[PDB]
Design a protein around this ligand. Structure first.
Ligand SMILES: [Zn+2]
Lengths: 76, 66, 136, 177, 116, 52
RNA sequence: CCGACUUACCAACCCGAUGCAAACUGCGAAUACCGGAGAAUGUUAUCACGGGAGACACACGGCGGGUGCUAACGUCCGUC
RNA sequence: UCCUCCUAAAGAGUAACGGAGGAGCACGAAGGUUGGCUAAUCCUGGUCGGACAUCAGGAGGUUAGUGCAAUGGCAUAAGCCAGCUUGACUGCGAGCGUGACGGCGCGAGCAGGUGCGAAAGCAGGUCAUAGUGAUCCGGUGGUUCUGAAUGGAAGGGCCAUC
RNA sequence: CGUCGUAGUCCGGAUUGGAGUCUGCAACUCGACUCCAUGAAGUCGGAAUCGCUAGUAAUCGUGGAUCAGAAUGCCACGGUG
RNA sequence: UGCCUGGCGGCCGUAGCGCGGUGGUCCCACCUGACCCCAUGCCGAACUCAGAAGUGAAACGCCGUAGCGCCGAUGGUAGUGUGGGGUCUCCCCAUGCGAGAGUAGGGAACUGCCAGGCAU
RNA sequence: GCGGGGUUGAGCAGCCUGGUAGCUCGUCGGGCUGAAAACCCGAAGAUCGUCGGUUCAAAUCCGGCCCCCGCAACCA
């Protein structure tokens, strides 16, 4: 046959969920596209990884006219 | 318009064969002599009879009689 | 013998056949043949049943077929070991869940429809029943 | 300029009374005149595309835009990005001058000219007509041209319907039929 | 269509200013009038607003839609902001080209005291 | 893998060099860029040279 | 050149009705997983470091499946 | 050996000679910044021109496009066009992700200097995920770091690289 | 004597449209000729092949038989050569 | 404090299309002109400047309208955690959660800050 | 099961990095011979085995299929 190949898993997914206290610089989700968009206090890395810029609790919300999922770091 | 990319364009005088003179702006530079204008072209008097449909029976009657 | 003109992929997983059916009511015709059992109808079975019921009604009225065999069923060649990749496609089936109306028919009398559906059902693996169109 | 002021008084009065318009701005007006020259043979030779550009610049006093193929097509053996045409957009004063020059000089010199077609108004009042020979424009020199080309004029107006555009063009004594 | 295109042009820089939490000076330019306002980092409340439709600013100008008028409204908005303590803002061109009237308002506000 | 690698030598006289790749068949002309030279702590012009 | 009608023929797009999909989703659970707070229970049951290992042939049964004939006390995973 | 979907049981991971396809490159611009723009397809009209070239208008709303396979993204466009340029910088890095390990990956911010922009700012390569080889031995350049009595040198170290 | 100046041409006249003349009861198939308009191919011809030794070949017109009309054919005749 | 207009939001279709009507004192839009500032891979169309003769025609705003898009119960169905059972490819019972589609119905947005014009 | 092949009527090149089809015999029409061969001149010809797929474009690239030619089908 010609179907024996496959690639190693990339271990994506949400790494820190909502209402979790995190330190600055910690990865929140590893994604391929921009499935979740960066909100307040969250930056977008080279491979679309959303990372916290300040210490606080993770906040998920749906915003915008396109109903996009935003991740922000609530103040703490 | 841009400064130098365009061709030379200024006023000229065009004189039709029927004496209808027109002053217009063009790129010829020199004056121009027209052989037919819009006011003299036969699209009001010449282009009516141009159909040349022809008749077979009137023509027949013209050639001879009984 | 019905079979898809094109397919996105050649082979398909074995799957399961749980749940109930969707086409419960007689939609187009006046009489239908409903399945009370569970299983898979092959293309050859569908073709044989269609021929039997058409001949039975002497090509009168109209007949609908609410199922279409779209699942490719493979099997390995004769006398080969268990590995060496999946087998080659041999026939096509349509997964049947209880309550699925298989065929419909109108333009003929009731008892003639009874006899035609019985002759058709006699060539099918699953158990069937006769149903009539209902308002609402 | 002549047809411009001619429009501004006579055409506006004529349209207001024959269409019973409530507002002056509702009267149709011509917005642009596009001059296209599709040169398919340019793929084989570049030396005849700058010539087409030159004679189009001569006809209307603007340097033309060398258009390019939007999408690749095999039937005419061209790839995306090849220059295959040249165009000119005329607006305002230049548009009016070219319009008067055309209507009073170019169209009477068309060989066997028996009137234009009134069935080329695209259903939304935008007229488009094609000429068969560029020699009808006195800007070019008949003996010094190398090949007889042809172009197509497009008169784009603000008229919503089809009869409004036809009436607007007729009001300038266009030679329809 | 033009207004939609202008909003589309401005809506990148507006999000960036909001993300940076900067108080922004928005300028709106129409053919006859020009308007300016300084809006808080939350984007839902303004702080100072000067414009040529105001009689107090209009009556000292020949025409409300020129470069001198733009300079006047820019200087006015800068003075009002400084009077209210707002002195560090970010300029939001709002889809217009940074040239002509908008550039005039900006450098007038700059020389008048504002910082951007 | 027709793209072969080269080195950009600094013009400041120091032996420092960057390294990259180039397609020598379609770009025969030499490469010149302004890059940071950490020895003199200034951005100087680097010129393409043979990788050796 | 234009064309002329109709012929138990096929048929794009659109509209109405009816199904199918592991590699379809304008919807969408139960579970499971991460984090915070509280009470009770459990011989710290949890984590870190150091000394010594063994093991890396697994089997069947239930549930979710691939492959096989929705064959096998068949084979390969997850979980108990 | 590496990448994409399903198998994979709605966090991660998960096997088979299971089902399907690709990679061993490319780019001095196809990278960075500023400013601007919106496709596919179809209808109508128009010279050569044709089912299909370029032009004008309409319907449509991303069914298009991304240097390439597939998946996830993308209108503030990551897609397309133009101007100026080298941040395809040097030393570092709070804190995480994934690995038995070797390792691989994301990263605000600090110091020096640079590009675009008026500026807020952005830029430590390319929309992201494949485009790859540990160590030994040897080659080139830089640096007194070392140099078997001493001063050199050879050899060795470190940095950059084959 | 004048014009054309190496060109598909003021070369070549085919083809076609319109208008006619003559013969013959009768010019549609199917005659000859004339007027106006039209101006194809053709720029010396492959393999091959024919006639001619002197007033000959080549070339230019004229007449006759047949015949109501209808030859670029046939049979004669001379000019240059 | 009432109406209308402009700018920036909250929210992201109960907020969007389509049909009919309506608006110019102010605002906004089309509009007039282009040596200049600036610009078209051609074009003052876009972008830009200097202005107010004309019109709300287009666009845009407001009002009305259920032809769509959209939201959407209650009840039932499918699925399922735990324990048990059968005729065990698939179901049933006790208990907890409970869709999607569809039905009645809802629905022509609501709201905050500032400025201008008209009345109180 | 694995390598190679399918191209004018027959035998065969070239499919080259995907825009482009060539040779011999044969065939057609004239020429030579009294006639037929041999010979001479001028011509013509293909949807590159079938069907899907990626391109603007497939005879070429990919996958499946049919036929032909080799290789292997062994230890029991
Ligand atoms: Zn005249």
């Amino acid at each position: 046959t010609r179907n024996g190949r496959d690639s190693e898993a990339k271990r994506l997914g949400v790494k820190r969920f909502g209402g979790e206290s995190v330190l600055a610089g910690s990865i929140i989700v590893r994604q391929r596209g921009t499935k979740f968009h960066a909100g307040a206090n969250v930056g977008c890395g080279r491979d679309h990884t959303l990372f916290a810029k300040a210490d606080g609790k993770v906040k998920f919300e749906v915003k915008g006219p396109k109903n996009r999922k935003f991740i922000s770091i609530e103040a703490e | 318009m841009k400064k130098d990319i365009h061709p030379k364009y200024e006023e000229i005088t065009a004189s039709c064969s029927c004496g209808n003179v027109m002053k217009i702006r063009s790129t010829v530079g020199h004056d121009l002599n027209l052989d037919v204008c819009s006011k003299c072209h036969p699209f009001f008097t010449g282009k009516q009879r141009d159909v040349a449909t022809g008749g077979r029976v009137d023509r027949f009657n013209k050639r001879f009689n009984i | 013998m019905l079979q898809p003109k094109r397919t996105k992929f050649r082979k398909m997983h074995k799957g399961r056949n749980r749940g109930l059916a969707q086409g419960t009511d007689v939609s187009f015709g006046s009489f239908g043949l409903k399945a009370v059992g569970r299983g898979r109808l092959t293309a050859r079975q569908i073709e044989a049943a269609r021929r039997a019921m058409t001949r039975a009604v002497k090509r009168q009225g109209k007949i609908w077929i609410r199922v279409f065999p779209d699942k490719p069923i493979t099997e390995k060649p004769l006398a080969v070991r268990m590995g060496k990749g999946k087998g080659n496609v041999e026939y096509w089936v349509a997964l049947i869940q209880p309550g699925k109306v298989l065929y419909e028919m109108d333009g003929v009398p009731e008892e003639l429809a009874r006899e035609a559906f019985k002759l058709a059902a006699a060539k099918l693996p699953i158990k069937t029943t006769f149903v009539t169109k209902t308002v609402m | 300029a002549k047809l411009h002021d001619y429009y501004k008084d006579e055409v506006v009065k004529k349209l207001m009374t024959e269409f019973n318009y409530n507002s002056v701005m509702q009267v149709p007006r011509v917005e642009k005149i596009t001059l296209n020259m599709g040169v398919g043979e340019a793929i084989a030779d570049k030396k005849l595309l700058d010539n087409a550009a030159a004679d189009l610049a001569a006809i209307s006093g603007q340097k033309p835009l060398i258009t390019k193929a939007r999408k690749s097509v095999a039937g005419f053996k061209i790839r995306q990005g090849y220059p295959i045409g040249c165009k000119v957009t005329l607006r305002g004063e230049r548009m009016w001058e070219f319009f008067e020059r055309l209507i009073t000089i170019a169209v009477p010199r068309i060989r066997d000219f028996r009137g234009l077609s009134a069935k080329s108004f695209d259903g939304r009042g935008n007229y488009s007509m094609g000429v068969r020979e560029q020699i009808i424009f006195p800007e070019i020199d008949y003996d010094k041209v190398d090949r007889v080309r042809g172009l197509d004029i497009t008169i784009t107006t603000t008229a919503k319907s089809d009869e409004e555009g036809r009436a607007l063009l007729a009001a300038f004594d266009f030679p329809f039929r | 269509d033009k207004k939609s295109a202008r909003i589309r042009r401005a809506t990148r820089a507006r999000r960036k200013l909001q993300e940076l939490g900067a108080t922004r000076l928005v300028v709106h330019r129409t053919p006859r009038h020009i308007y300016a306002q300084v809006i808080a980092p939350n984007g839902s409340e303004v702080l100072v607003a000067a414009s040529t439709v105001e009689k107090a600013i209009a009556e000292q100008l020949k025409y409300t839609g020129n470069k001198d008028a733009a300079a006047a409204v820019g200087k006015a908005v800068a003075e009002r902001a400084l009077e209210k303590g707002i002195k560090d803002v970010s300029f939001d061109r709002s889809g217009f080209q940074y040239h002509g009237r908008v550039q005039a308002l900006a450098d007038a506000a700059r020389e008048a005291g504002l910082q951007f | 893998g027709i793209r072969e690698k080269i080195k950009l030598v600094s013009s400041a006289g120091t032996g420092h060099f960057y390294t990259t790749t180039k397609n020598k068949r379609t770009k025969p002309e030499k490469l010149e860029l302004k890059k940071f030279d950490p020895v003199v702590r200034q951005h100087v012009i680097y010129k393409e040279a043979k990788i050796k």
